[PDB]
Curated annotation (Swiss-Prot), chain A:
It comes from the Bacteria. F-type ATPases have 2 components, CF(1) - the catalytic core - and CF(0) - the membrane proton channel. CF(1) has five subunits: alpha(3), beta(3), gamma(1), delta(1), epsilon(1). CF(0) has three main subunits: a, b and c. Produces ATP from ADP in the presence of a proton gradient across the membrane. The gamma chain is believed to be important in regulating ATPase activity and the flow of protons through the CF(0) complex. One of its GO terms (biological process) is proton motive force-driven plasma membrane ATP synthesis. This is ATP synthase gamma chain. Keywords: ATP synthesis, Cell inner membrane, Cell membrane, CF(1), Hydrogen ion transport, Ion transport, Membrane, Transport. It is a peripheral membrane protein. InterPro entries: ATP_synth_F1_ATPase_gsu, ATP_synth_F1_gsu, ATP_synth_F1_gsu_CS. Its main location: membrane. It is found in: Cell inner membrane. Belongs to the ATPase gamma chain family. GO terms for cellular component: plasma membrane; proton-transporting ATP synthase complex. GO terms for molecular function: ATP binding; proton-transporting ATP synthase activity, rotational mechanism.
UniProtKB/Swiss-Prot annotation, chain B:
This is ATP synthase subunit beta. The chain holds residues 343 to 457 of 458 of the full protein. Produces ATP from ADP in the presence of a proton gradient across the membrane. The catalytic sites are hosted primarily by the beta subunits. The gene is atpD. F-type ATPases have 2 components, CF(1) - the catalytic core - and CF(0) - the membrane proton channel. CF(1) has five subunits: alpha(3), beta(3), gamma(1), delta(1), epsilon(1). CF(0) has three main subunits: a(1), b(2) and c(9-12). The alpha and beta chains form an alternating ring which encloses part of the gamma chain. CF(1) is attached to CF(0) by a central stalk formed by the gamma and epsilon chains, while a peripheral stalk is formed by the delta and b chains. It is found in: Cell inner membrane. Belongs to the ATPase alpha/beta chains family.
Curated annotation (Swiss-Prot), chain C:
Belongs to the ATPase epsilon chain family. The chain holds residues 72 to 130 of 141 of the full protein. It comes from the Bacteria. This is ATP synthase epsilon chain. It is found in: Cell inner membrane. Produces ATP from ADP in the presence of a proton gradient across the membrane. F-type ATPases have 2 components, CF(1) - the catalytic core - and CF(0) - the membrane proton channel. CF(1) has five subunits: alpha(3), beta(3), gamma(1), delta(1), epsilon(1). CF(0) has three main subunits: a, b and c. It comes from Pseudomonas paraeruginosa (strain DSM 24068 / PA7).
Length: 276, 115, 59
């Protein structure tokens, strides 16, 4: 109604628009910090895969339980999610893909076990009733691989004990700065010279494979953090743009109120002067 | 309100309070939309001091006992200056926000916090 | 090792059973439980659709 309150609303929204415009640049800076951490983890995992591939071919007498598939009715999932909000659909599109693939197993009569990383995933399963077997949350923007050891071990022991038949990791892939793709990726069911194998080749394999699965989960967690900052950049850009529309609508209402006040005052001045 | 009339210590304390309150006014609207946790380390600390200063400005009056129920308080200029300098300098960052509301001198806030 | 290359595939912290097991027990203990849900809920899809359409009106 009054021209005083409309100015207060315009100022309130303008103050908010200034900080959402700042947060967009902060999200980009954190996205670049995450992209360099993704690149630093690649030279380790590619070498472990190269060693695993050679050893498994050079020693046919042994096949680790991770390298053979058991066709039975129980599955496991590691779900990666954010701790903070302000994401333009990052968790929503991921949970939609998780539910789509989980239903195929529920309908096929198979049981499901869940491992959860991040507070948003924990809140989703806590509210909808998911049977989480292991969970972790409040990890930094720069996570450490030692924090993942526990959650990954619980999921690996269940496969070694024959309780889990297949294990998958659910997270977002960094296609480009404007696109985050939600994906479900399998984990457990993975030149003519030999190494000297100082300790037993079978013992080395039993150790290298555990480091490989942990390195895959760590890379999935670090890449999801880069996707989270990219989703936040877009969300703060949209919030800045929507504030601009609200300021524009209020400015038209303010100008209409400004003109009406001058017209009323002149009507009162002329009316009073005609009576005197 | 001039250093040549009230001295530099009172003048600086008065301008210090005004600077903190003016900065808090432009942060208040942000907290209502994004929450207190979205702010910087300096802003989080400053907002707590601004809310304490805002409450320490309150005082029970002898003529207002009929409205407040609690007894009136008289606070001298030195006591006033010492209280605001302490809150501005961080001497009470550990006290809760509610300890400064309707108390009188700064020692009454320290005593109210224990209750 | 290879005749023209050397690689040390290091560790960030000492890996041993006494340290390795404590983290797994903590992950099992950290799993907060308030309701024993069947996992066969259909509600996940309704809430996912509700929020996915809201996120489209926002842009």
């Amino acid at each position: 109604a009054g021209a005083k309150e409309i100015r207060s609303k315009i100022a309130s929204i303008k103050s908010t628009q200034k900080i959402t415009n700042a947060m967009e640049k902060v999200a980009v800076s954190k996205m670049r910090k995450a992209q360099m951490r993704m690149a630093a983890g690649r030279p380790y995992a590619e070498r472990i895969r190269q060693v695993i591939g050679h050893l498994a071919n050079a020693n046919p007498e042994y096949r680790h339980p991770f390298m053979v598939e058991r066709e039975v009715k129980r599955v496991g999932y590691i779900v990666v999610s954010s701790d903070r909000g302000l994401c333009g659909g990052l968790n929503i599109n991921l949970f939609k893909s998780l539910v789509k693939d989980m239903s195929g197993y529920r309908e096929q009569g198979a049981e499901i076990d869940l491992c959860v990383i991040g507070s948003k995933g924990a809140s989703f399963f806590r509210s909808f009733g998911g049977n989480v077997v292991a969970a972790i949350s409040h990890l930094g923007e720069e996570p450490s691989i030692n924090d993942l050891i526990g959650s990954v071990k619980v999921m690996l022991d269940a496969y070694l004990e024959g309780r889990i038949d297949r294990l998958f990791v659910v997270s977002n892939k960094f296609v480009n700065t404007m696109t985050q793709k939600p994906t479900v990726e399998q984990l457990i069911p993975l030149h003519h010279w030999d190494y000297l194998y100082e300790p037993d080749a079978k013992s080395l394999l039993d150790g290298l494979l555990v480091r490989y699965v942990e390195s895959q989960v760590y890379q999935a967690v670090v890449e999801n953090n880069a996707c989270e900052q990219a989703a936040r950049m877009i969300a703060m850009k949209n919030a800045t743009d929507n504030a601009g529309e609200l300021i524009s609508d209020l400015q038209l209402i303010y100008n209409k109120a400004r003109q009406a006040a001058i017209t009323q005052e002149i009507s009162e001045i002329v009316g009073g002067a005609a009576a005197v | 309100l001039d250093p040549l009339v009230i001295g530099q210590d009172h003048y600086d304390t008065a301008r210090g309070v005004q600077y903190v309150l003016q900065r808090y006014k432009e942060l208040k609207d942000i907290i209502a939309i994004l929450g207190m946790d979205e702010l910087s380390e300096a802003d989080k600390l400053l907002v707590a001091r601004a809310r304490k200063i805002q409450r320490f400005l309150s005082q029970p009056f002898f003529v207002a006992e009929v409205f407040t129920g609690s007894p009136g308080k008289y606070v001298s200029l030195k006591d006033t200056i010492a209280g605001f300098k302490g809150i501005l300098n961080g001497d009470y960052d550990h006290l809760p926000e509610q300890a400064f509301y309707m108390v009188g001198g700064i020692e009454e806030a320290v005593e109210k916090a224990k209750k | 090792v290879q005749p023209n290359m050397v690689k040390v595939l290091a560790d960030t912290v000492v890996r041993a059973g006494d340290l390795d097991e404590a983290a797994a027990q903590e992950a099992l203990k950290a799993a907060e439980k308030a309701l024993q849900g069947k996992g066969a809920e259909f509600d996940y899809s309704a809430a996912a659709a509700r929020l996915a359409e809201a996120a489209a009106q926002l842009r």
